[PDB]
Amino acid sequence: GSVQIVYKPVDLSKVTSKCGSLGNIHHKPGGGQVEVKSEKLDFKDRVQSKIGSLDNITHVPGGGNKKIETHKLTFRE
Amino acid sequence: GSVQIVYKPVDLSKVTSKCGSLGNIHHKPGGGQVEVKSEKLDFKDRVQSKIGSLDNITHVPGGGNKKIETHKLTFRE
Amino acid sequence: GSVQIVYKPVDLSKVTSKCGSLGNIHHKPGGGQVEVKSEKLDFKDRVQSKIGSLDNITHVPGGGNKKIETHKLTFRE
Amino acid sequence: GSVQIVYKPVDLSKVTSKCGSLGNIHHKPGGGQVEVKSEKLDFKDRVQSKIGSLDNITHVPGGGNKKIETHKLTFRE
Amino acid sequence: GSVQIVYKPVDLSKVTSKCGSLGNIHHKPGGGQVEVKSEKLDFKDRVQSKIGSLDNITHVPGGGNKKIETHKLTFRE
Amino acid sequence: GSVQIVYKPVDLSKVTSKCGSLGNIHHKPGGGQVEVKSEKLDFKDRVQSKIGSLDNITHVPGGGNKKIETHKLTFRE
């Protein structure tokens, strides 16, 4: 009872961008007020949390091209 | 009772952009008021949370091209 | 009792954009008031939550082209 | 009862950007007020948390191209 | 042709307040965005102006009692 | 042709306050963004101006009692 598995995925893919000019961008946030109140906080096993945050981002990647590629080969007898 | 598996996916795909100019962008948020009240917080096993957030983003990727590709091959006897 | 499986998907696909100019964009949010009240919060097994959020985004991808492609091959005896 | 597994994934992929000029970017956040109140905090097993944060980022990668690629081959008798 | 003018105003007035306790007052303004644009400004003869102002006041006078009293006696031949 | 003018104003007035306690006052302004643009400014003869101001006041006079009293006697032949 033989098993013969072949996993030969080819990728010639291209995630690509072209942008002559990129700019003249303005991010003028006008300020705020946050309040949080808690008795008890508890967390476990791979929690990711933000509490009471006021936060501003400007992200201008000339690039910005992302590619995500996950091979899983699983074998059980 | 032989098993013969062949997984030969080809991809020649192209996710692509072209943009002569990109700009003159303005993000002027006008500010706010947030309030949250809690007795007890509890979290476990891979929670992702935001509480009481006031938050501004400007994301101008000249690129912006994303590609997500997941091969799973599973075998059980 | 032989099994012979062949998985040879070809993709020559193209997700594509062309845009001469892109701009003169204005995002002027005028501010707000949020209030949330809770006795007890509990969460488990891969919850994703936002509570009491006031939040502004400007996303101008010159690119913006996304492609999502999932191969699953499953085998059980 | 022989097992013969071959995992020969090829990738010739290219995540790529081209951007003639990139600039004239302005990030003028206007300041805020955050308040958080807690009796008891408890955390365990790989928590990641932010409490009471006011925080501004400007991220202008000329590059910005990211690629994430995960091979898992698992074998159980 | 005699003129005899008598101006004998009496005031025994009392502007008065009584307040046992005064307090527990909260003024949490949530922030804003103002913009003004002008070519030419010109002003003369006792102008009072405010342009492009964002401004917060808290005025808790335990007292607060005001009295304004103007005697004018004018004579022309 | 005689003129006889008498100006004998009496004031026994009292502007008065009484306040047992005064306090527990909080002024938490949340921050802002002001912008003003001008080619030419010109001012003369007793102008009072504010341009582009962001400004916070807390004024807690235990007293606060004001009185303003203007006698003018004018004579022309």
Author numbering:
A (entry chain A), B (entry chain E), C (entry chain F), D (entry chain B), E (entry chain D), F (entry chain C): 304 to 380
Which passages does the manuscript contain on this structure?
Dominantly inherited mutations in MAPT, the microtubule-associated protein tau gene, give rise to cases of FTD and parkinsonism linked to chromosome 17. V337 lies inside the ordered core of the Alzheimer fold, whereas R406 lies outside it.
PHFs were present in all samples but we did not observe SFs or TFs. The structures of PHFs were determined to resolutions of 3.0–4.2 Å and found to be identical to those of AD PHFs. Immunoblotting of sarkosyl-insoluble tau revealed strong bands of 60, 64 and 68 kDa, as well as a weaker band of 72 kDa, consistent with the presence of all six tau isoforms in a hyperphosphorylated state.
